[PDB]
């Protein structure tokens, strides 16, 4: 059947017979195909949404027509018509019945093959690798004969087979026989043609582009080089807007489908880095809300990732971190914005998972970082009560979330929590309790600024003297401001930009007054006023510690 189908596929492009005269008359009728399609759709949707429990030790103790449709007839004809470089029949068929792509994966791979050949010569012209093409050579066989060195080349031979992808099986190289299958196609000459033909091939391959990671990398590097080419010119914002739209519509849905493949997402984010962060948040949130639902394969992948993330999260321990950390890092780096939210909730209301997560942030790349900051702002802004139901006591999640944020600022130094600090500087205006709490924990954990509530007279005396006596006193009072100079400088640098220092000092001060003018039980009023006072004092101690010389008089 293979050779016969190949002969018909050859004949079916030199005009011997028209396509539909073959399509309409092969075995599986269109109705039986549609029935199989509905069955696959329902089974897939159920196994996605509900899910299935894989039995590990369950019950292990006490006390053919599918193969037919897949392997022959219409589907096999489509696969081969695609391999042999005749793209227009299959484009016209899949334009009508898109669901056909669910039947088998190989259609997406082969379509990606023809598209990648179409795009390769445009890709080499940019991101120039041609100057670097001259390094793919083999080592010469060296042998010592009669006490002298002798070099020889390795000898291989060439075989022709029916498999489309080339290979080299340990002595000999195999190639596709029909060596002029690429006669009817012309590669791209300019990125504009890349857009014009993306609108045809990629809109067909759909969310399944993820099945071929290499295409993601190639398109993203083309984008990076195209944006870099005109850094000087005035029209840069035009190209930025156009690539924004492109990445929104064709690539990001695809990268949402990947499976434990960090580097591809690293490339897509290396392209995304050029946008305003407003746009990145737009894309991330739309993908979260409207495109996870209402699209089948994306929904399946999101549900699989989420269930897997919860399964791993139930098994984090002080003893199993050595491998669970690597697995969680891969899973979070590949598909973050749907596998992070369960983790964010689990650390929102459980004790030690917070320390475990802050330990395992050491491993994931910039994409996981941006998405993590996103979901942090998400949770911080979700609609829910801040104070506890009982009385004026604050709820039991603010504290654990603030501890998490402080641990982030302390351990992983490539986090870029700038937007969170803009959240603080903004929402302090209205007196949000979460702002004050995050500020307190940030100052006390990262900076190391312990308060002066309980101090014996001798320590209090040493605490203002020459430098070494003061250092000994501070290390006695369990204060570690000296050893944390670098990270304190980094955080005060985050604060320095957008000139938040004076605004924050004035805000804290004029907030404690409004706290003085509220009405409640005195037993809480006195404590609140004093707590705010101590917070302000500690903040100013940090500021004087980190900003000295002229920077102080500049930004204070």
């Amino acid at each position: 059947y293979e050779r016969y189908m190949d002969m018909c596929c050859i004949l079916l492009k030199n005009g011997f017979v028209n396509f539909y005269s073959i399509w309409d008359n092969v075995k599986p009728e269109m109705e039986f195909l549609q029935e199989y399609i509905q069955n696959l759709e329902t089974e897939l949707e159920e196994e996605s949404t509900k899910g299935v429990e894989n039995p590990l030790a369950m019950a292990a103790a006490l006390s053919k027509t599918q193969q037919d449709i897949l392997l022959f007839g219409k589907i096999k004809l489509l696969e081969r018509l695609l391999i042999h470089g005749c793209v227009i029949p299959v484009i016209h068929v899949l334009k009508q019945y898109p669901k056909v792509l669910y039947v088998s994966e190989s259609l997406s791979r082969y379509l990606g093959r023809v598209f990648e050949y179409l795009l390769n010569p445009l890709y080499t012209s940019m991101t120039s690798s041609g100057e670097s093409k001259d390094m793919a050579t083999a080592l010469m066989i060296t042998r010592i004969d009669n006490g002298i060195l002798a070099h020889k080349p390795r000898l291989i031979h060439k075989y022709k087979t029916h498999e489309p992808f080339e290979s080299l099986e340990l002595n000999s190289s195999y190639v596709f026989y029909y060596s002029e299958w690429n006669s009817n196609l012309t590669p791209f000459a300019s990125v504009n043609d890349l857009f014009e033909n993306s609108h045809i091939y990629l809109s067909i391959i759909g969310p399944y582009l993820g099945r071929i990671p290499t295409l993601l990398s190639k398109i993203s590097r083309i984008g990076v080089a195209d944006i870099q080419k005109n850094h000087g010119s005035e029209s840069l914002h035009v190209t930025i807007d156009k690539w924004i739209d492109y990445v929104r519509k064709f690539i990001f849905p695809a990268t949402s489908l990947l499976q434990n493949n960090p580097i591809a997402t690293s490339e897509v984010y290396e392209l995304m880095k050029f946008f305003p962060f407003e746009k990145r948040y737009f894309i991330y949130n739309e993908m979260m809300t409207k495109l996870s639902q209402d699209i089948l394969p994306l929904k399946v992948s999101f549900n699989k990732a989420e269930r897997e993330a919860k399964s791993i999260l139930k098994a984090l321990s002080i003893d199993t971190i050595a491998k669970e950390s690597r697995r969680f890092a891969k899973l979070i780096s590949t598909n973050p914005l749907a596998s992070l939210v369960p983790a964010v909730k689990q650390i929102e209301n459980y004790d030690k998972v917070s320390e475990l997560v802050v330990y395992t942030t050491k491993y994931f790349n910039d994409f996981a970082y941006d998405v993590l900051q996103f979901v942090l702002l998400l949770r911080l802004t979700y609609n829910r009560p801040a104070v506890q139901f009982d009385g004026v006591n604050q709820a039991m999640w603010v504290q654990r979330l603030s501890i998490f944020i402080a641990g982030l600022a302390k351990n992983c130094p490539n986090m870029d929590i700038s937007n969170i600090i803009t959240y603080i500087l903004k929402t302090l205006h209205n007196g949000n309790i979460i702002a004050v709490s995050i500020l307190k924990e940030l100052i006390i954990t990262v900076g190391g600024i312990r308060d002066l509530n309980e101090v014996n007279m001798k320590q209090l005396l040493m605490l203002n003297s020459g430098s070494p006596l003061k250092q000994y006193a501070r290390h006695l009072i369990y204060d570690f401001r000296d050893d944390n100079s670098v990270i304190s400088s980094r955080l005060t640098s985050f604060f320095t930009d957008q000139s938040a220092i004076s605004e924050i000092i004035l805000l804290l001060y004029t907030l404690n007054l409004k706290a003085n003018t509220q009405n409640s039980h005195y037993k809480i009023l006195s404590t609140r006023c004093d707590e705010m006072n101590t917070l302000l004092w500690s903040f100013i101690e940090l500021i004087k510690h980190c900003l000295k010389g002229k920077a102080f008089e500049e930004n204070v």
């Binding site: 903004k426 205006h429 004076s502």
Partner: peptide, 26 residues
Amino acid sequence: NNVWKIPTGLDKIEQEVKKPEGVYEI
């Protein structure tokens, strides 16, 4: 978008206080 629509600036923190003098009618 809402929490990013709040106006932030030195002109708004002034919120001038009440003078110490308190008039006469836990």
